[PDB]
Amino acid sequence: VSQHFNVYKATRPYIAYCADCGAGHSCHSPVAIEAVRSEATDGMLKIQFSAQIGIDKSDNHDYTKIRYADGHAIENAVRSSLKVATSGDCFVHGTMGHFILAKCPPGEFLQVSIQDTRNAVRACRIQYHHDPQPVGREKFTIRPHYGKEIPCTTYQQTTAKTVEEIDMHMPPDTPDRTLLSQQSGNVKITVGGKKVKYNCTCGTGNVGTTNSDMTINTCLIEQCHVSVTDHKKWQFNSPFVPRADEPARKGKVHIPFPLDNITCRVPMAREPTVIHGKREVTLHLHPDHPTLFSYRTLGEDPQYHEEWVTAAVERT
Amino acid sequence: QPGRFGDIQSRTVESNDLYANTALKLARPSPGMVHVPYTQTPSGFKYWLKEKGTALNTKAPFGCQIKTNPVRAMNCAVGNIPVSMNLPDSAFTRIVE
Amino acid sequence: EYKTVVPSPYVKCCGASECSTKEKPDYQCKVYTGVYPFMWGGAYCFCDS
Ligand SMILES: *[C@@H]1O[C@H](CO)[C@@H](O)[C@H](O)[C@H]1NC(C)=O
Ligand SMILES: *[C@@H]1O[C@H](CO)[C@@H](O)[C@H](O)[C@H]1NC(C)=O
Secondary structure: OHHHHHHHHOEOOOOEEEOOOOOOOOEEEOOOOOOEEOOOOOOOEEEEEEEEEEEOOOOOEEEEEEEOOEOOEOOEEEHHHOEEEOOOOOEEEEEEEEEEEEEOOOOOEEEEEEEOOOOOEEEEEEEOOOOOOOOOOEOOOOOOOOOEEEEEEEEOOOOOOOOOEEEEEOOOOEEOHHHEEEOOOOEEEOOOOOOEEEEEOOOOOOOEEOOOOEEEOOOOHHHEEEEEOOOOOEEEOOOOOOEOOOOOOOEEEEOOOOEEEEEEEEOOOOOOEEEEOOOOEEEEEOOOOOEEEEEOOOOOOOOOEEEEEOOOEEEO | OOOOOOOEEOOOOOOOOOEEOOOOEEOOOOOOOOOOOEEOOOOHHHHHHHHOOOOOOOOOHHHOEEOOOOOOEEOOOOOOOOOOOOOOHHHOOOOOO | OOOOOOOOOEOOOOOOOOOOOOOOOOOOOOOOOOOOOOOOOOOOOOOOO
């Protein structure tokens, strides 16, 4: 059981750039979206996510918390505040770490949001098409009480054994302009419990202060540059944060919810009305939803036809 | 070719060649932010999964029923079957009987 | 269907880089001359151009 604990205890959430944070303005958010996957013919879609679901900021496994990142700290969010949305509103079938498992109405975008400790709403919105279609020859909406069974593919919630993984690396240097404190000609550096990489111009510079406060009595607060430089944890190699080395050594972490075979029920269209003409027949077709109708003759030249029928029609 | 069927190719499922012609192309980052823009023709498998056409299943002469993993055409109605038999002597009845 | 792999960009403050060819399919790599990333809460480089 401890394998999950170990794999999620070396990794932390991050902050990426979201171009539409729920109001049409960009921001740096803890809930930026990395990728939406849709391989299940069940209509399920699984989305990646910079925050981490199911793990406490204290690293314990809690199923009622989501841990995110603001600034340099890591706090806890109430798991009941997780919302996934499209044109309509979605149903969440499973969550673990960076991944959500939702089933949504058709839309033109996708939105996910949480509530931080201040009870503010942090959201990210991306453009996503999402026009799902069921299996078979009928475009139905809701499964019937009577029908047929056809093979389907979903995302099982085993979360245990998987072949696929994602890369992981060390975070880069994190700039922070609030670490500078100015006095009368003095430049105080208030380390908050974390090593700070350092570079000024006029006086000193180029020191990795392993948890040491300093003052500079020569330079100015506008003449320097600081950045938190500790790296004890991994994070996903997103294209919206930079990396720290060109050799670029990487880790790997198995992702949950693999693809599996399942059977999904489908309806059957009511048989049409057949009228026997001479060397031909007429069919009255009454569909409850778009339905596929085709015919062919059993000869040397088949003489076929195919069509999606959406309203009641007659075919000879 | 990009955006059409077989824009990426592979000899087998476990092969490790992976020919790819997807017209990938990088772009300069916009000033003031970290990101890696690029442009690339969308998948040709996904294009084919709409524009493929009508299957042999729908239009097959003589009422052939095109079937699963062993690709076969069940129950076509063409031709004649010559058959030759070698009956034993005990399969017949004497004229006097 | 394919999958485009896009790693984190490499930024070199007061420096320069060189493109390196690789064995991957449809692999592209470019280096852009003068940037100023502004990572978050800062500029991420102390180096104007
Ligand atoms: C420190 O900053 C100067 C210019 O401000 C730059 O030339 C030098 O490379 C920097 N050193 C480090 C270690 O970042
Ligand atoms: C489903 O069954 C097929 C056999 O037709 C198999 O090839 C596949 O690996 C199974 N699992 C999937 C599709 O996830």
